[PDB]
Amino acid sequence: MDVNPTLLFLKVPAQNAISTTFPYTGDPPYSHGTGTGYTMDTVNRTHQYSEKGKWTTNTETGAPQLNPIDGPLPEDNEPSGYAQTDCVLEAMAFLEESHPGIFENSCLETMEVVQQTRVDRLTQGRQTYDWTLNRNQPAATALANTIEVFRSNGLTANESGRLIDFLKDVMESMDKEEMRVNKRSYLIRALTLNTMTKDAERGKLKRRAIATPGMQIRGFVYFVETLARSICEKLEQSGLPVGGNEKKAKLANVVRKMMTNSQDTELSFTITGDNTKWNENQNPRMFLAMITYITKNQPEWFRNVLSIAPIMFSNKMARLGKGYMFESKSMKLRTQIPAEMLASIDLKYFNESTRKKIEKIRPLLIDGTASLSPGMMMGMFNMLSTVLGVSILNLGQKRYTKTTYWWDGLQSSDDFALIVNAPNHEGIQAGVDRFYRTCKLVGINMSKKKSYINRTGTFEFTSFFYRYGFVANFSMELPSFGVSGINESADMSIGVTVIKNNMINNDLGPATAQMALQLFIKDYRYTYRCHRGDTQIQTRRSFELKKLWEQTRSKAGLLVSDGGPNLYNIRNLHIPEVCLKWELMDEDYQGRLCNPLNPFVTTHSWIPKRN
C-alpha cells in the first residue's frame, strides 16, 4: 500500500487545511554565500525594468541615476516601472476629496509629535549601518558614534537633546567638505546602504537580498512613517498598521461592504495575489510628489524636513557586499577577493553567468558601490506605498471610474485583494484589464504568474485566508517555546508572557498553548534540574527538594523552581506565579521569600557569572 497526505487535502477544504502547505516547521534555508551575486542580479533586473527610461549623471557623485517617470508607456505585458506623476496627483486628489480633513489632521499629529519627539527613541533599533567601520553594527554604538563625530563637527545639536535640530545639523555638516573625508566621498558614504543577504526568507528558492539603511536616514523615514501611520489609522483600507483581530475584522468588513449585491443582475469576481517587484518598480519620485501634495497648506519647514527622505531615496549607492572567494583546482588554494576592485579585474576568472552580470554592472560602478535609483530599497516597512496603491482601489468608487464596473478592497505592502462588479464575464474582463492597465500607469506591476481570480467568498490576503466567513490566519510561525536564559524567577515569567502575547495577537489556540506551557515547564525543570519534590528522578539538587517538600505545611502551594507544581493554565497567564501561590503558602516560606536580607534582591532572582 502507498500513502499520501494530498488526498486528505483533496476532500478537505483548502483554506482550512492550508497549513498543510505551510511546511515551515524546520530551519529556513539561508544564504551560506555572499549575497552580492543576488544583489547584482536584483540591480540588473530593476535597471532592465527601466531601460526605456533615460538617466543623467548626478552632480558630485559620478553616478548614473535613472528617472523612469515621464518615460514612455510600456510596450509589452512584461512588467516595467513606467509611471506618470499626474496619475499620482489625481489619485491623491480623489483621495482627499473622498476623505476630507484627514490630511490636515494627520499633518497636525505630525507637527505635535515632531515638537514632542526626542532622539532617545530611535537608538532602540536593530542593526543600523555605521559608516566608520563600513559595516552594519548596533544602534546604541551608532548613536554614540554620530554624536561624538558631531561634537568634533562645528554643530552642537547632540547637546540639544531634541531631534529635528539634530537632523538639521546632520544635514549641515553633511554639506561640509571635510569631517577626514572629502565631500564627494562623504556623500557617497552617507547614502551608502549595506547589501546583507536575506535570511529566513520562507517560501522561495532564490534570495531577495534585503538591503538596510543607516541611522541618518532612519529619523526621516521615522517621521514620514509616523505620518503614514496616522493617515493609515484614519484610513479604513490599510492593512499594515491595523492589526490583530481588528485587522481580522477589517478584512471581513470590507468584503461585507462590497459583497452586498443590491440589484444583483451582475456577476462578481474578487482578485487576490501578490504584486511582484514591489520594491523594484516603485520609485521615490512618486513618493516625493505624494508628500508635496499631502502636506498642502502647512509650515514650509515641515514640508522640507519631510520631503528630505524621498530625495535621498532618489539617489542611493548601495554596496555589493563582501566579494567572492576564488579557488585553485590543481594547486588547491583559495582567497577572498573584495569586490571594491571588481571594476578593475579581468573577466576570465569568473563564472559565465557571473561574467555577463559583471559587464552589465561594471559600467554602473563608482567607488565600487553600485548606484541606482529607479527602484525602492529592498525590504523597508515603507507603507506609504500602501497609501499609494490604496488610492487605486479608491478610484473604483462608482463616482470616479464613471462607468458600470468598479473596484475596491485593501492592500498591504505587497499583497492586494480587489473586489469588482460588472454585468458579465466580458464586463468584468473589461474592468479588470482597465485596472491592470491603470495600476501599471502608476508604476505598479501585478504579476500574471502567481496570482489568480475567483468568485466572491474565497480570497487570500497577507496569509489571512478568507473563505466565505472563515478567517484562518498563518501570518507568523510559533517561535521557540523555550526559556529565555536569565534566572529561575523571570525566565518563567518571560515564557508565560510570551505565550500570552502570541495567543492574544496571533492564532495560538489554547489547545496548543497548554501544550506549549507543558513543554516550557519541562524545559525549565530539565535546565534548572528542579523537578517535582514528590518524584523519583535524580540530579544534584533533588536532595533539598525532597527535604523542603516534607518540610512544608502547604505542599502544592510552592513555587516551581523549588519543587513546586505549576498551577498556570490559559485562564491565569498574565498574572505572575507567586501571586497565585501567596496566600496558599505558610508564613515560614513566605517570610523566607520576601526579605531584604537576601542577596538575591524575588529571592529566586539573581545575576549569573559572565563567561
Partner: protein, 511 residues
C-alpha cells in the same frame, strides 16, 4: 536648514519635465485633476493588458517530474532500517554519563563477525572506513576496561578518521596579489547540481515512518486545574493528540534527533579540536517497565570551529542495521556497508539468525540545522496547531463545535491512501500520525526546493479548490507556475514525492 545643496540634489531628483523644487511645489499646490487618466488609457498600447482565461478542468497537465539518475537518501540518520540495542530497564536513581549506557548496551550483544565490506562505495576508500570502525571498537574496550572511567572519550588521530574528515582538505586564505599571477583560479563552481529522478525507496521509508511502533516514546506532566470551559476543551484536545502521537515512529525520530543534535551542539560549543565519540542515545519509557536508554548508533564527530552558525561541520555516523543492502542499492550511493555478523532474532517459530550490517556513512550537518533539529518539539506542536485549525474551521461552518465528533468516532472520513484501483480511508489517528511525520520530514529534508514547491503547490491547489467548487477561477499565466515548480524540483526526494503525490492527486481528484 536645507543649505541649497539639498535643493540641488532635490531638483536633480525630480522628473524631467520639472527642473526645480519650487516649480514642482507650486504645480502640486496649484494642482487639480482634469481627467488625464482616460487620455493615458486611450493613448496606451492595447498589447499591455492582462487578459483572463478559463482555467479549465482539462487544462492543467500532469506536472512532469525531472528525469535523471535515481533519487538518493541524505538523512543524517537512517530511519526504517535502524535498530536499537536496549539497556533492559535500569534503575531509577542511577544516572548515567551516556557512553557507559551505550557501552553496556553494546556489551549486551554478541554476534560480531569479522568486518568485511558488503557494498562497494564506488568512490572514496571502503577499507579505510572498515578500519575506522575497528578503531572505534578497540578504543571503547580499551578505555573502559583499563582506565579511570573518563566521562567523555575523544578518539585517537589516525589515517582512517583523518581521511574521512579531511583535516588536510582545507586550503588557506591568501592575498590577491600573490595569486592573481595564477590562472588555475576560478570564482567557484557555482552552478545547478545534478538532476534526480523519483524512485520508490523514499515512499517505503515514509510508509514505515508513519507506522506505529510499540513503545510510548514520550511522557507528559500535569498543569493547573481546569475550571473555565475553554480549559476543558484544550485539555481534551491535547490529551487525544499526545496519546495518538506518542506511539509513532515519527516521535521516535523526534526524540532521537533532539538528543543527537543537543549532544552535538554541547560538544561543538564545548569541544572543537577533538574527534569525539557520541552515541545516538535516546531515553524511552517502556509501556510496561522502566525507563530505557536505547543505543541506536555510535557517532564520530569531526572537528568543529564555528566562526559562523551557517558553517558546516562534518563527521562520521555508525548506525546498526539488519536489512541487507543490494535490495535497493539506489537508496544509498553514499553509505559504506560493513558486515558485523549475525543477530539471533526470535520469531514465533524457530530463530531467524539474520546477518547484521553496519552503515558507516559520512556526513556534515551545520550549527543551524542542529538547532532546528533540537527544536522539533515545536514541530509536534505545529501538527497540533494544524489539526486544531481544521477543527475550528469545522466548528465555524457548523456550530456544533464538537471536537469529540471527530477525535474518537469510528468513522471513515479521512483519505490518505492510494491503492491499485482504490483509495483507502482512515481515521484521525493515522492522519495525525501522517501530518506529524510530514512535518518531521520537513524538518529533516528542509531545503529551498521544498519552500518553493510549497508556495507554488499552495497557489495552484488553492486555484484547484476554487475550480472544483465551481467558483469560476482564472489564471493569467500558468506555464510560469509549471516551469517554476519544475525549477524547484531539482533533486530532493521528499520534494519529488510531494510532486508525484500532487500528480496522482490531480488524477484521482480529476480536479
Amino acid at each position: 536648514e536645507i543649505t541649497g545643496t539639498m535643493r540641488r540634489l532635490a531638483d536633480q531628483s525630480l522628473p524631467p519635465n520639472f527642473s526645480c523644487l519650487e516649480n514642482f511645489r507650486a504645480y502640486v499646490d496649484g494642482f487639480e485633476p482634469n481627467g488625464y487618466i482616460e487620455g493615458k488609457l486611450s493613448q496606451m498600447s492595447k498589447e499591455v493588458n492582462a487578459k483572463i482565461e478559463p482555467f479549465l478542468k482539462t487544462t492543467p497537465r500532469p506536472i512532469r517530474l525531472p528525469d535523471g539518475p535515481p533519487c538518493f537518501q541524505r538523512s543524517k540518520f537512517l530511519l526504517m532500517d535502524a535498530l536499537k540495542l536496549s539497556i533492559e530497564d535500569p534503575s531509577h536513581e542511577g544516572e548515567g554519563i551516556p557512553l557507559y549506557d551505550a557501552i553496556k548496551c553494546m556489551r549486551t550483544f554478541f554476534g560480531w563477525k569479522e568486518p568485511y565490506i558488503v557494498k562497494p562505495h564506488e568512490k572514496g576508500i571502503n577499507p579505510n572506513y572498515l578500519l575506522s570502525w575497528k578503531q572505534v571498537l578497540a578504543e571503547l574496550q580499551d578505555i573502559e576496561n583499563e582506565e579511570k572511567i573518563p566521562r567523555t572519550k575523544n578518539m585517537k588521530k589516525t589515517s582512517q578518521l583523518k581521511w574521512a574528515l579531511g583535516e588536510n582538505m582545507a586550503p588557506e586564505k591568501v592575498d590577491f596579489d600573490n595569486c592573481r599571477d595564477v590562472s588555475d583560479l576560478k570564482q567557484y563552481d557555482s552552478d545547478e547540481p545534478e538532476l534526480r529522478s523519483l524512485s520508490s525507496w523514499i515512499q517505503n521509508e515514509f510508509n514505515k515512518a508513519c507506522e506505529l511502533t510499540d513503545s510510548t516514546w514520550i511522557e507528559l506532566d500535569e498543569i493547573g486545574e481546569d475550571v473555565a470551559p475553554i480549559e476543558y476543551i484544550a485539555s481534551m484536545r491535547r490529551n487525544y493528540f499526545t496519546a495518538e502521537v506518542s506511539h509513532c515512529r515519527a516521535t521516535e525520530y523526534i526524540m532521537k534527533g533532539v538528543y543527537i543534535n543537543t549532544a552535538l551542539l554541547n560538544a561543538s560549543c564545548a569541544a572543537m579540536d577533538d574527534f569525539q565519540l557520541i552515541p545516538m542515545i535516546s531515553k524511552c519509557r517502556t509501556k510496561e517497565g522502566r525507563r530505557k536508554t536505547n543505543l541506536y548508533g555510535f557517532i564520530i564527530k569531526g572537528r568543529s570551529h564555528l566562526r559562523n552558525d551557517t558553517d558546516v561541520v562534518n563527521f562520521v555516523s555508525m548506525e546498526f542495521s539488519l536489512t541487507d543492502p543490494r535490495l535497493e542499492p539506489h537508496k544509498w550511493e553514499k553509505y559504506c556497508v560493513l558486515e558485523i555478523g549475525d543477530m539471533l532474532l526470535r520469531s514465533a517459530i524457530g530463530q531467524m539468525s539474520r546477518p547484521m550490517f553496519l552503515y558507516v556513512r559520512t556526513n556534515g550537518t551545520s550549527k543551524i540545522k542542529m538547532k532546528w533539529g533540537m527544536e522539533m518539539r515545536r514541530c509536534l506542536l505545529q501538527s497540533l496547531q494544524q489539526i486544531e485549525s481544521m477543527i475550528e474551521a469545522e466548528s465555524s461552518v457548523k456550530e456544533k463545535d464538537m471536537t469529540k465528533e471527530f477525535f474518537e468516532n469510528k468513522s471513515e472520513t479521512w483519505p490518505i491512501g492510494e491503492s491499485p484501483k482504490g483509495v483507502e480511508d482512515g481515521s484521525i489517528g493515522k492522519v495525525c500520525r501522517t501530518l506529524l511525520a510530514k512535518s518531521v520530514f520537513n524538518s529533516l529534508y528542509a531545503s529551498p526546493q521544498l519552500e518553493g514547491f510549497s508556495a507554488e503547490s499552495r497557489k495552484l491547489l488553492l486555484v484547484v479548490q476554487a475550480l472544483r467548487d465551481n467558483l469560476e477561477p482564472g489564471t493569467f499565466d500558468l506555464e510560469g507556475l509549471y516551469e517554476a515548480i519544475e525549477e524547484c524540483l531539482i533533486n530532493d526526494p521528499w520534494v519529488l514525492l510531494n510532486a508525484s503525490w500532487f500528480n496522482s492527486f490531480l488524477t484521482h481528484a480529476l480536479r
